[PDB]
Amino acid sequence: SEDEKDPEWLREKTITQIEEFSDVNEGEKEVMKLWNLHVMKHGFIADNQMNHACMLFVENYGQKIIKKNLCRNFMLHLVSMHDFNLISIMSIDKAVTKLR
Amino acid sequence: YSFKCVNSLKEDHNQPLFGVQFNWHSKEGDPLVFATVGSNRVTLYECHSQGEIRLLQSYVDADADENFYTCAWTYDSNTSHPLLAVAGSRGIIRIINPITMQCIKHYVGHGNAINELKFHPRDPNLLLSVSKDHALRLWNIQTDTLVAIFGGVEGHRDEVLSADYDLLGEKIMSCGMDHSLKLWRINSKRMMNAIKESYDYNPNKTNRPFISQKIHFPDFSTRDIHRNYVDCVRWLGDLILSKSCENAIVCWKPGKMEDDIDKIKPSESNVTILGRFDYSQCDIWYMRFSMDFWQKMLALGNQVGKLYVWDLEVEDPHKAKCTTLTHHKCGAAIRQTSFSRDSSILIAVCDDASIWRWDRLR
Amino acid sequence: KRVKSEYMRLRQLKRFRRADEVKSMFSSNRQKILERTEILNQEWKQRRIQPVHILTSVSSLRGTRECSVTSDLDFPTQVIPLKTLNAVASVPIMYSWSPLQQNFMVHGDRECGFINDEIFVELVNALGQYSDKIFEAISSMFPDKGTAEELKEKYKELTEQQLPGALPPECTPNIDGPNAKSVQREQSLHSFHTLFCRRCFKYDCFLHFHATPNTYKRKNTETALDNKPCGPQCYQHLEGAKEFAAALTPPENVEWSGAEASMFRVLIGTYYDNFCAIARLIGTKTCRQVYEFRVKESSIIAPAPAEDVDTPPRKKKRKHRLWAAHCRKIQLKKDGSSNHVYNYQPCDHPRQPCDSSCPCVIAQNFCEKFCQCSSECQNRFPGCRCKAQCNTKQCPCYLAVRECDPDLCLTCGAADHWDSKNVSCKNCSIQRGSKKHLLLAPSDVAGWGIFIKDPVQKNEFISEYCGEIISQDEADRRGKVYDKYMCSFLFNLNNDFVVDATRKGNKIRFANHSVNPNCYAKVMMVNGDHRIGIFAKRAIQTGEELFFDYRYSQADALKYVGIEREMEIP
Amino acid sequence: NKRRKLKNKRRRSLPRPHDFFDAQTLDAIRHRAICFNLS
Ligand SMILES: Nc1ncnc2c1ncn2[C@@H]1O[C@H](CSCC[C@H](N)C(=O)O)[C@@H](O)[C@H]1O
């Protein structure tokens, strides 16, 4: 195939572009790095997928969230989607259970 | 400085001449053999006393109508037989063994043309062929398998023509018509894994072909050094030489003068300029200088046929005490120069199929 | 000339100390040269080398040519025969590029730019060394006017003494970081809201918004609010605490951190009442002292709005034939031109209706769900309910340039099994990217070409034409550069943009040209993103070569794609 | 296809498909032929 969802060099370039931002603390910076790299890895496009990506992303990297100890930033990152209507309350509960 | 022309031979084909090569990969007491690539002919010679030069076995590319551009001496550990790779405008690599009198290793895949050839200082089985399509591909000739490629999505947006290995083979500088200065660290943890795996491959092992890698992120880049085309950069130890068409040669180091070359991050953009060995009468590119084996003596030809000579000693561009050697008979275009594995013999090649050997006057 | 000498010697102070320094690493590199050169020389000593051998005559090839290298000096001319090198096949020319499965938007003179501020500090030394003659001597060398009255101004610029730097000037560390301040709810989401881009629901999207955060009004009473004694110490478990909580619709010694109080400010903005869930989130406190501090916070801060709306329209009265009238209007006024294709832009109507001032309306295009036009906007798409497959002439979406959105063509399963690859619909592929497998080979027509691996039928989806987003004017410049070497990788995506695949793209960019192609190009509308796909003009078997019309001018076609590779049967 | 004409129905002008023979073998054959005619 030689083709897939996401080329490697693209992953490198986006990570580098993240570091350029100065207003973002590294706790947040890692958050979208994992979350974004989760995205074009799978290429979700639907709101249903958006929610399904939530328990999916926490399922794969919830331990890594503990390892990075960037949970609190990650809950806030979730709340934005609930403000963007892509997240329901019970979805937030799922992340808490997965984390703990 | 202590030099004079003692010999001069001219090829009968009258074609423009190109990259010279002296077999520094020799042993003590071996015959001093050097090679040169013409348009389609390839010729080898050995320097001799009294000013004599004995013509050695010479070949011609009577099948590929192309102008050869670069060549590099080669050696095989297995047979102890030296060789020499060649390249030209068609972007095809041929490696002839004088013991075999022939080339049996065929390597194609570059886009337009090849403009640079150089081996790894330690491993003789690794080669960089800088190409016209801005590509930096690596070959494991011993396994005939391709190794990682450099450039790509964030590489040079213009043709690269000049690149160099460092003394230990850890970082590789690259510069092209875009005047960009991109280098990549060989020691990067990923690569030697592939290089080791490059030596570990069997075509019959599996249907999956070997996975050469791709790089797009140099450890540093800049363009402020020259406002004109750059065609001559060399690893002066931890320092970097650089020559353009603007009749100047400049040496420089990354960041500040105290900054370690190996500590420099890719995000770095600062420059430290410490070279002013400028010249003139050579406002055109595609001229290449030469270095002595011990990195102690610099000699550069001229389009008008003169020489620009300096040592690599404590003599520094603070005053740049030049040595402008000149032979009246040679004035057309000094295309390249080549030292021996010492500082005794210098061979200057003119474009009009003529060479001019200068022997040290020590 | 003393002032120039003072200025020169002031400049010389770093000048010769540089010369002293450069000599040092000149030496340090030289020893490193000596160490390494000897080391490699030692290994060169180890490597036994075979001495050269001279050429010999080959009996079977006496017809080979002989060369006589003429000696410029007195030396005799030496003769050695030539020899034909090995023959190697050559491949078509091609320039470097990088794979790409989406779309991406996009000297040597002077030194150091600015007049050196250290020379200003050297000029400051001229201020400190200080009557009027000194003022002009200061003012003469440096461009400034450094009289004593100007000494103060230079002193004023010296008093800066520091820079805020490239960082959030406010103390806003990551909340997980212990140094996180008691930041309010809004400021924390500022970093998230600014960076995020919902149209591709990624932070710092590479294909795209800053006008508003999620300022839309939303229902807040959807919570069940089964306030029960479930949190050992809670708003419940105490009638006074429970009654006070209901009426508001002292915390214990367990204090609240600034970071705890900061996201406490956030959690209220989410629920405004759910102390238990807040306590579930905030493991640092039980439900009591969460509700209590909520009482403390609600006592300090203003109460939340907590507003809900239902709108006058409920059902019906929105027959889609009324929408047919609107586009009929749009077609008759402006879209009758059928040439001014505009990229979608999210129109914003915070209080305005979807009037004729609507950016989508003036853009002759529908309002997307990303627009701020409400759920009652008449410029939005209705929903693509083609039962069998949203794929044919009866499919309005197929008639439209819009691919049936996953959330709309529920009858063709566009939303169904987004993970799965096979669906009933045919006009939903680009979203799923069900590309076919291709082969790269030197085309018969010219250089490299594209060949298909498997047979396909008419009007079947094929791989997209990926590339980079660039404006029309620069497309001229790059195109201007392109014509100097007969290159073509610019595609007129719409009236406002052209895509380029010269540097980034996928394999299909190498497709050749033909006037009678088996494939054709067709613009399409996907999720507010203009894209171009290719489809088979006829049914196709294994191993075909692919072609499509580049559709330049007739004179241009002769200029670039004049090869037609056709014999005339009649 | 019933109206299928001869095989010539291919193209007007296309890049050369590259010749399989080589030069150095050609000279060897000629000299082999030359020395063959000598006897
Ligand atoms: N039918 C045709 N005849 C001659 N040139 C063509 C052609 N179709 C495309 N080209 C050229 O090819 C470029 C498109 S990129 C494709 C290059 C070509 N397929 C090859 O590999 O050699 C255009 O700049 C155009 O000039």
Author numbering:
A (entry chain D): 583 to 682
B (entry chain G): 80 to 441
C (entry chain E): 17 to 122, 158 to 181, 220 to 297, 304 to 344, 431 to 751
D (entry chain Y): 170 to 208
Quoted from the paper:
Polycomb repressive complex 2 (PRC2) is an essential chromatin regulator that harbors histone methyltransferase (HMTase) activity mediated by its catalytic subunit enhancer of zeste homolog 2 (EZH2). PRC2 is the only known factor that establishes the trimethylation of lysine 27 of histone H3 (H3K27me3), a chromatin mark associated with transcriptional repression and whose tight spatiotemporal regulation is essential during development and differentiation. In addition to EZH2 (or its less active homolog EZH1), the core PRC2 complex consists of suppressor of zeste 12 (SUZ12), retinoblastoma-associated protein 46 or 48 (RBAP46/48), and embryonic ectoderm development (EED). The binding of EED to trimethylated-lysine-bearing peptides is central to PRC2 activity since it allosterically activates EZH2, a requirement for efficient trimethylation of H3K27.2 Upon engagement of specific methylated peptides by EED, a flexible loop of EZH2, the stimulatory-response motif (SRM), folds into a short α-helix and stabilizes an active conformation of EZH2 by bridging the EED ligand binding site and the critical SET-I helix of the EZH2 catalytic su(var), enhancer-of-zeste, and trithorax (SET) domain.
The linker histone H1 is another determinant of chromatin context that has been proposed to cooperate with PRC2 to suppress gene expression through an unknown mechanism. Interestingly, we were not able to detect nucleosome-bound PRC2 dimers when JARID2 was present in the complex, even when using a JARID2 construct that lacked its lysine 116 methylation site (PRC2J119–450) that would otherwise compete with PRC2dist binding to EED. Comparison of different PRC2 structures shows that even in the absence of K116me3, JARID2 likely outcompetes PRC2dist by sterically blocking the SUZ12-SUZ12 dimerization interface and/or impeding linker DNA binding by PRC2dist. Interestingly, cryo-EM analyses of PRC2 incubated with H1-bearing nucleosomes suggest that H1 binding and PRC2 dimerization are mutually exclusive since all reconstructions of PRC2 dimers lacked density for H1. On the other hand, we could see clear EM density corresponding to H1 when a PRC2 variant containing JARID2119–450 was used, a condition that prevents PRC2 dimerization. Notice that this PRC2J119–450 is seen in an inactive conformation, as expected given the absence of an allosterically activating methylated peptide, and also that there is no direct interaction between H1 and PRC2J119–450. Comparison of the nucleosome-H1, nucleosome-H1-PRC2J119–450, and nucleosome-PRC2prox-PRC2dist structures shows that H1 binding gives rise to a linker DNA trajectory that is not compatible with PRC2dist binding. Therefore, these observations indicate that genomic occupancy of H1 is incompatible with the trans-autoactivation of PRC2 by dimerization and agree with the latter being context specific as indicated by our genomic data.
